[PDB]
Amino acid sequence: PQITLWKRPLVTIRIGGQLKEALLDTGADDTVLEEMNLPGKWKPKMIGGIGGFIKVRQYDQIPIEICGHKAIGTVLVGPTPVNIIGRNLLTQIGCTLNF
Amino acid sequence: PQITLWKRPLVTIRIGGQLKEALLDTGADDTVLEEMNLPGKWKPKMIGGIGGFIKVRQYDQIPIEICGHKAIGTVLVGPTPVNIIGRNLLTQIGCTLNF
Numbered sequence A, B: 001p002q003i004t005l006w007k008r009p010l011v012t013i014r015i016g017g018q019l020k021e022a023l024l025d026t027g028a029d030d031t032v033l034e035e036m037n038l039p040g041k042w043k044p045k046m047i048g049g050i051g052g053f054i055k056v057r058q059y060d061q062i063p064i065e066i067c068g069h070k071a072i073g074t075v076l077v078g079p080t081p082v083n084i085i086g087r088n089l090l091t092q093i094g095c096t097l098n099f
């Protein structure tokens, strides 16, 4: 689709059988989801944003269906304010900015 | 133009003929710029994301040119590590997300 920006670009995603709402976030390099269970191996990592750094759990090679479009990639889980879909997955689904 | 997301969507902006590089950020409700001593009235505000909140100064009706396109609106000013063009101005320059 084409998504305008008068409202937050929130879309439904499917991850591990569950529907969640997440924010298409071009200013985020990585994809970060609120506290959740995901199967398999993970590694501790830290990431920075506007307010400081946080600790996250890094899951590699995870499938997410983002607004009907399939991605498989790195998902970070931790204390983000909102579920955010970052460039690592926006690129997979062919997302570009246009004006 | 079309901006892919392989890299950070940094573009040239101008505010008071200071030219800065800024993120076209669909994840940001409001534009937030690095510390700069802008003239005019302002109100205090606190904005939050990954890592917590920062204190910013809200200036209204500030003109800004974004990649050659004119905008005018609210600009938040404070200790952000990156200049962020948020949805409040992205809409004014006709920016969409497309996939």
Ligand SMILES: CC(C)CN(C[C@@H](O)[C@H](Cc1ccccc1)NC(=O)O[C@H]1CCOC1)S(=O)(=O)c1ccc(N)cc1
Pocket: A023, A025, A026, A027, A028, A029, A030, A031, A032, A047, A048, A049, A050, A051, A081, A082, A084, A086, B025, B027, B028, B029, B030, B031, B032, B047, B048, B049, B050, B081, B082, B084, B086
């Ligand atoms: C977290 C989202 C919901 C909101 N942020 C926008 C996001 O795009 C934010 C922009 C940013 C990039 C790099 C350093 C600092 C900030 N990226 C972000 O944290 O990227 C992290 C998570 C994964 O990759 C790195 S915001 O900066 O906090 C924000 C809050 C309020 C306003 N008015 C404007 C901006």
